[PDB]
Design an enzyme around this catalytic site. Sequence first.
Site, mmCIF file in Angstrom:
data_model
loop_
_atom_site.group_PDB
_atom_site.id
_atom_site.type_symbol
_atom_site.label_atom_id
_atom_site.label_comp_id
_atom_site.label_asym_id
_atom_site.label_seq_id
_atom_site.Cartn_x
_atom_site.Cartn_y
_atom_site.Cartn_z
ATOM 1 N N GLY A 39 0.680 -1.282 0.000
ATOM 2 C CA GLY A 39 0.000 0.000 0.000
ATOM 3 C C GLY A 39 0.713 1.344 0.000
ATOM 4 O O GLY A 39 0.075 2.358 0.283
ATOM 5 N N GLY A 40 1.997 1.387 -0.326
ATOM 6 C CA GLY A 40 2.680 2.667 -0.451
ATOM 7 C C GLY A 40 2.032 3.515 -1.542
ATOM 8 O O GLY A 40 1.559 2.993 -2.534
ATOM 9 N N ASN A 48 5.810 -3.495 -7.399
ATOM 10 C CA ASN A 48 5.770 -4.313 -6.201
ATOM 11 C C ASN A 48 6.296 -5.719 -6.481
ATOM 12 O O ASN A 48 7.080 -6.247 -5.725
ATOM 13 C CB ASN A 48 4.337 -4.400 -5.675
ATOM 14 C CG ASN A 48 4.261 -4.346 -4.170
ATOM 15 O OD1 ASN A 48 3.722 -5.246 -3.539
ATOM 16 N ND2 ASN A 48 4.817 -3.309 -3.586
ATOM 17 N N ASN A 107 0.669 -8.864 -0.218
ATOM 18 C CA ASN A 107 1.500 -8.280 0.811
ATOM 19 C C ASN A 107 0.942 -6.983 1.356
ATOM 20 O O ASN A 107 0.266 -6.231 0.660
ATOM 21 C CB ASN A 107 2.953 -8.127 0.375
ATOM 22 C CG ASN A 107 3.126 -7.130 -0.708
ATOM 23 O OD1 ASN A 107 2.356 -7.098 -1.651
ATOM 24 N ND2 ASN A 107 4.160 -6.305 -0.595
ATOM 25 N N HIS A 263 9.888 -4.981 5.545
ATOM 26 C CA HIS A 263 8.508 -5.083 5.101
ATOM 27 C C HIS A 263 8.359 -5.582 3.663
ATOM 28 O O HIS A 263 7.344 -6.159 3.313
ATOM 29 C CB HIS A 263 7.835 -3.724 5.266
ATOM 30 C CG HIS A 263 6.353 -3.731 5.057
ATOM 31 N ND1 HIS A 263 5.505 -4.556 5.756
ATOM 32 C CD2 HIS A 263 5.563 -2.966 4.269
ATOM 33 C CE1 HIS A 263 4.260 -4.319 5.388
ATOM 34 N NE2 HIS A 263 4.268 -3.351 4.495
#
Lengths: 283, 283, 283, 283
Positions: A39-40, A48, A107, A263
Amino acid sequence: LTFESTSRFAEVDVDGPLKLHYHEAGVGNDQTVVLLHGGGPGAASWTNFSRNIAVLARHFHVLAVDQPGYGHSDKRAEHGQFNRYAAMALKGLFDQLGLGRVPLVGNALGGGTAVRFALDYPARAGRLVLMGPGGLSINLFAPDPTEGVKRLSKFSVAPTRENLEAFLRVMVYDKNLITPELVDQRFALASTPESLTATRAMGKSFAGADFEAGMMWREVYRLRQPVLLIWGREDRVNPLDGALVALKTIPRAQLHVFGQCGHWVQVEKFDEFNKLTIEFLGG
Amino acid sequence: LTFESTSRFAEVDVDGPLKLHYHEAGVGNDQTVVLLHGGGPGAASWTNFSRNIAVLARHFHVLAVDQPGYGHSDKRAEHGQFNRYAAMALKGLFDQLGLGRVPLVGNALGGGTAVRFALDYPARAGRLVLMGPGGLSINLFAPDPTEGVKRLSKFSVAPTRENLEAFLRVMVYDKNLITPELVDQRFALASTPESLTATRAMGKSFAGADFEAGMMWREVYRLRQPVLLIWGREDRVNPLDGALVALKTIPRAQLHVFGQCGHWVQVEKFDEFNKLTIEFLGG
Amino acid sequence: LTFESTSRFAEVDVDGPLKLHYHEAGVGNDQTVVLLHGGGPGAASWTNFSRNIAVLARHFHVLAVDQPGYGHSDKRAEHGQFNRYAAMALKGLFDQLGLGRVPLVGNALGGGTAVRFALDYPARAGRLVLMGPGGLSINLFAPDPTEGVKRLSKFSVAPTRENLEAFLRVMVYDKNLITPELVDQRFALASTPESLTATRAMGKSFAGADFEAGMMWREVYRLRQPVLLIWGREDRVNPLDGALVALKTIPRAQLHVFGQCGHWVQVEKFDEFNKLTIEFLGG
Amino acid sequence: LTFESTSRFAEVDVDGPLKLHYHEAGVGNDQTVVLLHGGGPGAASWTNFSRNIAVLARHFHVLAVDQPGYGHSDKRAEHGQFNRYAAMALKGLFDQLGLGRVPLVGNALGGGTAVRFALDYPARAGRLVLMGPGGLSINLFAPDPTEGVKRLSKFSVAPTRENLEAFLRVMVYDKNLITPELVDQRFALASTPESLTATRAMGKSFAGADFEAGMMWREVYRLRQPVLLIWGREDRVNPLDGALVALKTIPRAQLHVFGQCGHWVQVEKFDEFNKLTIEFLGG
């Protein structure tokens, strides 16, 4: 495989037309697998899952979907609990593509969507692979918001390159991975008007009356499928203590933790992650 | 591969001649791997690693060693901290077989020996695979002795079939695995005079002045190699909370937890365990 | 204060007449406090809270209630989720005694009832003091059933003195507290026909369709009052790892852990427990 | 009681003359108690223990000591492992004041010094009260350096008001406690040349060969006295997961956790903290 060769679009119904952009690879492979990115603000499927799609595509029919508000999917100015919203869009896609029961790899935010989907449409979700997932995690020891969450919040209020770099730097163990190029690239995408709208939408959704849907740790004891939780030991967004309720309560759960990994598991431990995922999904 | 075809003996020096029985398989395979079994009274290499040796032997040169006091290795009536003692014997074996730096796979008591060896003879130990290991575990939440440990203690004082069955039943998640045949077989071996001597020796070692050597959780921050910790979620001997100090402090640590699996990981999840081990050891 | 001087009975309605026995002390003290005992088969208010009632009665108006199925309260052969059932009876008592919003002190099973009451009748419950409580605990690390739970189950199927002694011995850290007199006393009460009926009732309730009511860890984030969790570090029935979800999710939670103390906090650390409780309840 | 009325100085020997500033209160009270403050750059005894000294002084003879490098104690440009260094200075003070075995109250860095003292001079340390202590804590789940530690590091490299405010804001749960006045006050003290020297000294000590002395979690199993660990649930410097090894391994340990409380327990929960401490220290 290229961004362009794999690019696909679909229109689904979530309180009206909703456009979804996704990447398709490995056509011809019998078992379809759906990937849901993190979710960045400047995150998307292609970036991603760069170190992963081509690899997984060797074994599976890969559909890497941009979640609503990210990449090239619609970026609405308003929506309810995000995971439930993105889940509705995935259901629309599943139905449109004639998919039945399919495994999901997700993720962070995308893991939260995978789970919400598995709970809301229990028949349509197969095995789950979840890397530092939100939603089913509850940080038993780390004060909330975590450093990672706080840094994303700061950028949301002050969208500067400095703030994005600080955010990105808590995404990884090896901070050398946060190069000027990576910073500039993510910043160009994260600071567009549409991404800011998406961010403002995410923020307002937090304080909705449907907040319970996000508290998925209360529900995962209902999941009947095998679930592989994967965590970076040094995850500073959704820290390792967040794994515990889900490991305990999901009957067929497994957990893999990588030391020296943050992360972004799929990046920092791409080879190890790719291999676990292939074996797990029976490929 | 049979017990007999693979059987080997070696005499090493640990405060004098000490006989070691072991099983050798996969001769010709380039990478040697040493397996160290668990600590139940009637346990040994062959029975502990039944679902594993033939498989691993396909990829590696397997040496499955009976630890002093078990199987067909010498069963002395006295010794110091057990793990340090068994480590000394392994060193003798390594030297005699011309082994250099070799990876070690050890479960329960045998994991504790693997670690003690890796700390005492740092150059001779390669990657470690440790299943519900003793020694480096410290049960942060479970009161000690655990149910599993207490049940072994009871059998040690009252060596009856009833007590052994109760002990075995807390070794597994699927108690159906504890069949009358298994119970009878283990009991025949566990109740011999020599096994009782071994048990009495183990007991007396507990209260030695060298107890610190057993507290390996204080030392594993010194280990430089990759270490794969493997745990059964429902381990009732060395419970999952015992994994935490080692996961945190071992720089290149990894952890895999299997839901629906007890203390005997290599049995209850033999396929999953075999595959993790092969991949990890680079084979 | 004696069993007899404090003895009281009340008839309340829970799907019909239900008799409740309780002890009243400290009449005249302004703040009423309700104590809910633990769940051992021969347990009751008077024996559970022996080292406490007289002390607390110095500061509060104490109502120590025997929970349905225990002591001198009705022992029905059937009921739903036990905590919800006992909660309904407490509500009946509250209403009958004209109580409003009152603090509750509950250990083990009785803590689970305190919580179920606080959730079901949110207005009627004040501050909560909970010692090794069931219901809101979820053992993140310990395999279930725990040793303590299993031992109670064994006695439930084979009601012998031997089995009760084994059960009692995992209630305390200092096993010297389990004297022959204590064993004989509890056994006389635990093995009566009525207690066996209560036990058989408890067993059948476990497999009811209302099991969710017992999973209180999913709900305690709704509690608005201060809650003091108290745990014995060596609790072998509801182990310390069970405290975590409740500590994290209850906004005004506090936790006190006593080293060298088992499941019977009010006994093994009676002085320390009494003092924490008095201070907490503002007395 | 005022800063001036209680001010005292002492010269002790730690590789030569070392001046120590401290505050003395409650003279005439029979039991002496020593307080060791936290480690923020502008921290000192008087400010750290403002809501506490007067209160504790009602029951005990209070000696609140400024640790070397803080307040008005000498601020050397070099020293070894800080806790061992500060311990040596306390020993000098103890000897000079004719103190024997005295209880110690220490928060954060000051808790680490209390423990190092208790281990190095086992006879001179009585009961310990430790609030979010360093040294004996090992963060089993939180990636290191924590947000709190990182923020202190940032100020150490860039000593601006902005950076100090950000640091202070992760010291408390109620960020409203971080007022402009507090920020300005701490900043004036933290940015003096001497405090910068102290900071540079602390930094260089981190990479000394005596680092093991700081890893006190490996040693606290040697402590024979009662130890009260006190933690803020939302501690972002030394987080709650850091409590676990010490709670487990210290035989006579106790733990109290306050919800809605950060790293500054003595401030945010001063009343509750004061009361626990008085009762614990037998006063």
